[PDB]
Design a protein around this ligand. Structure first.
Ligand SMILES: *[C@@H](CC(=O)OCC)[C@H](C[C@@H]1CCNC1=O)NC(=O)[C@H](Cc1ccc(F)cc1)NC(=O)[C@H](N)Cc1ccccc1
Ligand SMILES: *[C@@H](CC(=O)OCC)[C@H](C[C@@H]1CCNC1=O)NC(=O)[C@H](Cc1ccc(F)cc1)NC(=O)[C@H](N)Cc1ccccc1
Lengths: 305, 305
């Protein structure tokens, strides 16, 4: 019993982290097979991040300008190339610890674990969600760029995120492992703002289920609602609209608890308008929205890797 | 910027997890050098759990009765001993992945990372606190006994917890790696309940410093109180008393922010009597008490391992 914010075991990803230095700029890299991935802004000069032409910066740089370190072991660079906003450094040694992996682009509302790293070494691991405005609410300091986000399916590590920057709001932005930024953000020192961040409704509902599975039931009422009468209340409170795909994806949880999605939706509508009245759910005084239905099923069924 | 519930990287511990089977019962064990540690109720079914005489069941068992599996490979048990509630199986092969480690007994209020495992394979990692009533608020299903909690102090893995039981209230209980239970609990199916749980005052203050470090400053007032004055209110809300040792432990966070501990205490006093004004602090609507002062420093200074 119980329910916690649970990250994936970080071991398989620890073995791919390395340190990447270009000039005086050091950050983290991801070493898979004979390729080291990292943010292209590592090649930037100090006065190059204002108006950077990375294509042209890469021509000026030799393979010898890139120092990669796996532990205290130097990996010789024998090639450098740029896919979108990620630098790809070809090295002469294949990572013996390369896991079965895939590069995936995640959607808003989907969660993942982040291995925060500095100078190629891990600091900690936590669970994040891709917000509906394509930012993440992480914990990153200077030197954290190149840290990756990931999920694990049995033995396959699906890398979904690489950390690039911090917006003035304290939120975080980055790319997939193919260099495409999530959201409208770019790696130029320009005024860029995230749209209104909305609450991931399907996750709050998955979370309420998890609450039900664990014995928290004070919020369950006997009223019901329709998908449109709930969404009318939802959009007033900056909640994402609920669709039939969301009702279906919660099927498993509805089928383990016997509670109809729309029944839980009525309980949720009551909590939005009236609050919690100094009560808590799963130890929280807020409606948590960084648990997907799969995360709930995973943590209430014992899925191992 | 940012503040998340961050666990230690779990790689070093993943490489010590194995599966231990005795009869029909399987659970997780910890394989360090040539010894596997695991809960001693592995030698029990659901018949002797009334008044289990682990002394007889141990002698009545043979080395061949214990099946130990490290992934695919099978480890041959060549001896067995008991140290309180932990079983020690000597095997004929030493773990090549054994980290520098120590067995430590943690104090109430201290945190650690839990690597939840099932059938010797990790499922997830999350951060827990030893509650003042010597329970933890974990996430554990059937098959999870033997999962361990730990801290990483430099290059040394400090194992502090092995999971044994869930109490009917839904909280969890276990031992250090020497087999001594935290709290007045015993590894047998007899009536057991934890004392009343209090809030870890020193951890709440550390967390408020974390909020200040990350720009959350709305709850700061200009006031200052006395240690005795603060404790008078602390007791009214079921908060641990604040000792001078706690005050000193917060020294580093007071030094970084310029806010005296007794000034922070006055701000916490006002939050307790008047509530959080419908506002959040570091993404939470409750006062969080599972971050130690050290947890705050390492996440806000990027300590690596
Ligand atoms: C990682 C940089 C790194 O590790 O390599 C040098 C040590 C940085 C992580 C930031 C630091 C603090 N918390 C974080 O999440 N990333 C940056 O520092 C980023 C680098 C950058 C500068 C200019 C660009 F055009 C692209 C990338 N700088 C920032 O995030 C600053 N907040 C400035 C900023 C840049 C883009 C949009 C808004 C603000
Ligand atoms: C770990 C058991 C295991 O892995 O072995 C499988 C063969 C269990 C973890 C629990 C399961 C559900 N959620 C959890 O966190 N531990 C137990 O099941 C525990 C084991 C035990 C059985 C018989 C004994 F004599 C000692 C220990 N049993 C329980 O937790 C039950 N809640 C019963 C109970 C025991 C002590 C105090 C209160 C209730």
């Amino acid at each position: 019993s119980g329910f916690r914010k649970m990250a994936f075991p970080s071991g398989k990803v620890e073995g791919c982290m390395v340190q990447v230095t270009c000039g005086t700029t050091t950050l983290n890299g991801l070493w898979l097979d004979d390729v080291v991935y990292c943010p292209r802004h590592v090649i930037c000069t100090s006065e190059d991040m204002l108006n950077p032409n990375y294509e042209d910066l890469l021509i000026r740089k030799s393979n010898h300008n890139f120092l990669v370190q796996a532990g205290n072991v130097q990996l010789r660079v024998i090639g450098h190339s740029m896919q979108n906003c990620v630098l790809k450094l070809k090295v002469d040694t294949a990572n013996p610890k390369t896991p079965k992996y895939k590069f995936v682009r995640i959607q808003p509302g989907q969660t993942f674990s982040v291995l925060a790293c500095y100078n190629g070494s891990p600091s900690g691991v936590y669970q994040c969600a891709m917000r509906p405005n394509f930012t993440i609410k992480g914990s990153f300091l200077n030197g954290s760029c190149g840290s990756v986000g990931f999920n694990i399916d049995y033995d396959c590590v699906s890398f979904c995120y690489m950390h690039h920057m911090e917006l003035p709001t304290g939120v975080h932005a980055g790319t997939d492992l193919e260099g495409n930024f999530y959201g409208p953000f770019v790696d130029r020192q320009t005024a860029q703002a995230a749209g209104t961040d909305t609450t991931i409704t399907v996750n709050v509902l998955a979370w309420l289920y998890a609450a039900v599975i664990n014995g928290d039931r004070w919020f369950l009422n006997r009223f019901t609602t329709t998908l449109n009468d709930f969404n009318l209340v939802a959009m007033k409170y900056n909640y994402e609209p609920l669709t039939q795909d969301h009702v279906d994806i919660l099927g498993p949880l509805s089928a383990q608890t016997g509670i109809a999605v729309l029944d839980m939706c009525a309980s949720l509508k009551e909590l939005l308008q009236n609050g919690m009245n100094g009560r808590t759910i799963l130890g929280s005084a807020l409606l948590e929205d960084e648990f997907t239905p799969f995360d709930v099923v995973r943590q209430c069924s014992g899925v191992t890797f």
